[PDB]
Amino acid sequence: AAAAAA
Amino acid sequence: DITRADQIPVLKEETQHATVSERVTSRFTRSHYRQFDLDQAFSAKIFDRYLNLLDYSHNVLLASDVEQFAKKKTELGDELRSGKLDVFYDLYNLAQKRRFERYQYALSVLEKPMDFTGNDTYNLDRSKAPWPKNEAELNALWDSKVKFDELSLKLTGKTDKEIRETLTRRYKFAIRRLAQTNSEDVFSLAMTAFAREIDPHTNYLSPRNTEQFNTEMSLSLEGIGAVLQMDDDYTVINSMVAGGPAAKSKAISVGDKIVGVGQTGKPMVDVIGWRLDDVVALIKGPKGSKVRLEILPAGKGTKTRTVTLTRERIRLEDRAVKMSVKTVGKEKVGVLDIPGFYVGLTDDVKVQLQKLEKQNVSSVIIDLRSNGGGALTEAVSLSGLFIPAGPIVQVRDNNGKVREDSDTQVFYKGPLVVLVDRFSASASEIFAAAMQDYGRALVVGEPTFGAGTVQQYRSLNRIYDQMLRPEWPALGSVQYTIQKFYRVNGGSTQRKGVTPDIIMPTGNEETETGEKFEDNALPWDSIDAATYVKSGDLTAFEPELLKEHNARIAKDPEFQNIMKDIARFNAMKDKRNIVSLNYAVREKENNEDDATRLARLNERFKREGKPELKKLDDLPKDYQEPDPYLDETVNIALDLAKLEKAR
Amino acid sequence: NTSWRKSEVLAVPLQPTLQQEVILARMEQILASRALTDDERAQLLYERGVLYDSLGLRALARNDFSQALAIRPDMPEVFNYLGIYLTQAGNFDAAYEAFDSVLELDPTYNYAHLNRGIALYYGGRDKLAQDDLLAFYQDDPNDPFRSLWLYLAEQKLDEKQAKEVLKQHFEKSDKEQWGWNIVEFYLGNISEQTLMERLKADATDNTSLAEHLSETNFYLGKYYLSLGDLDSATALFKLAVANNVHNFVEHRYALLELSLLGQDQDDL
Amino acid sequence: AAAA
């Protein structure tokens, strides 16, 4: 998945 | 239990770790957005980073220890490629003995009777301090350390034998923790040194950590639905998830202790002398699976009983979006508190939006404060609920390829507000920028975190792994940045963050946190704007919203200790990393504070009805503080709906 | 007049042989039957995949390769094709992962080095490409294409050093294989026309000619492309593809280059 | 505090 976090 | 250096186990790299190292290395070296060479220079930086991870406060290792090791500091690259992580391991091991040596030393210092009235100080940031030159320096630092601790407990107001007793259990506990250290503990640490050297958002996750991240992403876990706490040698059950297996069974209670864990065709394994994570691992399992627990009941009795449970899928509702209505006379405003961009969030929001229609809420606030982020798809879809069509975000790889992500219509067309703070990041920033760029919603709060990159999450498991190495445990996972993200504007929130239309007071203060303060964070830049159609235009409404907002906070009592609290905070930042260490002065400051703390609740009450009563409610209950940012926001939301209505 | 057309060197574009078609037909019937064990099925699937690949039917080959893996996940040979397809698709990152698997399963699978090296090159990680490529060269220093591939990678880093390294490889070599002629052209030892003359002389039959043309036109295209002559490079890549030598890397990469050129045009 |  592609994550845009923290 | 441990009293000697030979009671510290020699940590050894696991059989599968080399393979993992190699796998992480391939990925990081070939596919990271940042193209770096894992050469000698890079390798030395990793070593430096590892040392800081190993001894953050430069308290345990001697400069001679560091220097002995520095001789092979450029060998790290060869090690990672090979997976034979000896220096990471040899260093960790030495650190263990040094920690033990240090704690044991502290054990001595505590016995020395010292109560102090000097003016000597303690600094909390030893991050860049030179390594202790000698044992004398080491003992001296630790002499200083133990002082700080006892002093802090004494500040609570105990005895001296207590403080000794309390600290005794602490230093001893710390010793126990050292003996409980994993091979995995070291391997995870070594990978993190490597990952963080590349960029701030790149990581290695161990098998257990990977599982946890997936759970946070999915809001779900597979097991028995019980939250576990470890007290001494015992795994105690703190609470039970409602609707979960342990809770529904009626055969397990809070305070019960799990001393045994049993797999279906195997023996009950005694887990008294275990690490918490090792125990939780035995408990958790595939849904439909069975686990039997040996439980020592909560009382003083010695009898044990065995409980068998069927593992199942449990949802963590607490982490889900939450909806509430704020009422101000005739008008209502809905609020969605979104903790993260979990998978399935958009769906969850849709039902909530549907409920809100029923209540005839005039405005909707979306609360992203402290929302770290999450799935990119979720950011795009959530945006799509409020925006009819077009690109939500732009993504670009390291070679300039630009792609735009968009949705499939609009679920909610009404007045909208997004509430943000310094801790709202990434996906949260993407959503906020988009609402703002399209003119869809007003943004209120503090300037954002400044995250501007996309990470790829990929498992390290290979399809033939089970077949060829059944004995192996699961491998972990990696997250690595692959692209930069840009607003539809062509603008970037990297480093900058998004600037709210209306900014709370804490907003104008110099922040000490953010993407910009992280190690090796990528630079800000920009690209050409995409093609999109503005949803609406709110630029007109701004001066009026501004003044109305300004007038309200000026009067507000809560919105004033914040102002005053601010200038005051400004006064002590320089001395912030230095604490007094004088039993006398802290209390003046300390009670000077408690006093200040136990007071201003009163100007607000007198201003109101008043709310409650306390000449000095010095010993309050379990207090829930008010939320002024939100209350003011709601006020802003109503102003917005009013203006939109008058178009 | 048009007498010039005489200068063109072309083969009849390759066609499927009868035996290839016959085998494909038999394979379908066998696969549809109950005559195979799971191990045999996986093996046959790999075999059909290779044949489909040889005919330019890549997507069909990929299906077969995928199905084989589902049965037996420990086939390095299958992973190798998947990597190659991923490279062809411009998915270099995934491709790397596939090549790793080939090596992990079987460290003696030499061609993976060449293929991973090629993928890394397209991926823009030249030094890393060079490691695979150098290793591939070591395995057979006498194969001119191994040197050419290494040169292409090295050239990204330092053209001058790359040329010298290539010259050494050539001098160091037995110089027997046809491919060394291409290398001489890259070196400046011979001219393009001479290279072409030699190609005509070397080839024996139509298949032989097509193979020579497929490899040669690909390298010539790369050479022109490097110099910035886009039109010449484009004609050469098309000319390489025209041979229908589906399994040559020269063929695959010519197609990839064309696709890159196309994308660029579509931008601005 | 971990969930099992």
Author numbering:
A (entry chain F): 1 to 6
B (entry chain D): 25 to 432, 435 to 673
C (entry chain B): 21 to 288
D (entry chain E): 1 to 4
What's the publication's text?
The levels of MepS are regulated via proteolysis by a newly identified protease complex consisting of Prc, a soluble periplasmic PDZ-protease (also known as tail-specific protease, Tsp), and NlpI, an OM lipoprotein with tetratricopeptide repeats (TPRs). NlpI serves as an adaptor protein that binds Prc to target MepS for degradation; however, interestingly, the latter two do not interact with each other. Prc belongs to the large family of C-terminal processing proteases that recognize the C terminus of protein substrates. The lipoprotein NlpI has the dual role of bringing the soluble periplasmic protease Prc to the OM, where the lipid-anchored substrate MepS resides, and enhancing the efficiency of MepS degradation by Prc.
